[PDB]
């Protein structure tokens, strides 16, 4: 007669992700003219722990 | 039990004893437009679930057999219902029993 664990996870309150110290969403760069027709050069400035 | 397929009995329309063909009465199909059926369908529509009792406590094992008699008069095809006592096995016009015969060995 009680809402079970796993059911309580969708409400989010206590079961939200711990995103305080995360470094950002890891993504490719958005596709544009340089991606679509040639290439663009970037430099790897850092390698970090997320 | 065994009853013959014909019997000479009183006909109310003729007013006298006449030959009658004898069949077994079966309950007809429900009309779906009988007033109680209409009331039941209206009651059952919507929410609330089952609104009338459902018996589900059967105790009898037999039914009273009903004989449908039909006067054989061409101008009088009048019908009547006779009920006989409860029986488990009923047949119409079966092989009549004999007395001085050998039982199968």
């Amino acid at each position: 007669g009680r809402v079970i664990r796993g059911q309580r996870k969708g409400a989010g309150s206590v079961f939200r992700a711990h995103v305080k110290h995360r470094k950002g969403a890891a993504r490719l760069r958005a596709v544009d003219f340089a991606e679509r027709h040639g290439y663009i050069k970037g430099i790897v400035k850092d390698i970090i722990h997320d | 039990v065994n009853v013959p397929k014909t019997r000479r009995t009183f006909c109310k329309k003729c007013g006298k004893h006449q030959p009658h063909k004898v069949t077994q009465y079966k309950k007809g199909k429900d009309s779906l437009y009988a007033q109680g059926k209409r009331r039941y369908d209206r009651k059952q529509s919507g929410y609330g679930g089952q609104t009338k009792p459902i018996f589900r406590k059967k105790a009898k094992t037999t039914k009273k057999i009903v004989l449908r008699l039909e006067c054989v008069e061409p101008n009088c095809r009048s019908k009547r219902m006779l009920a006989i006592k409860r029986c488990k096995h009923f047949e119409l016009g079966g092989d009549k029993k004999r007395k001085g015969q050998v039982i199968q060995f």
Binding site: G1, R2, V3, I4, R5, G6, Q7 | -
Partner: protein, 49 residues
């Protein structure tokens, strides 16, 4: 879940810690019931692949 009471889990309760019902549960089970092996095509040990 077997270590829980029946009020907060389908598998809870009993004088012994046993599931008491098949742990494989259908896909269209309501939430609050589909616990255990959800819509499992098979169970066991995976001997062969």
């Amino acid at each position: 879940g077997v270590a829980m009471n029946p009020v907060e889990h389908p598998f809870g309760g009993g004088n012994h810690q046993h599931i008491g019902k098949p742990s494989t549960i259908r896909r269209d089970a309501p939430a609050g019931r589909k616990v255990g092996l959800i819509a499992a095509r098979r169970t066991g040990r995976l001997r062969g692949t």
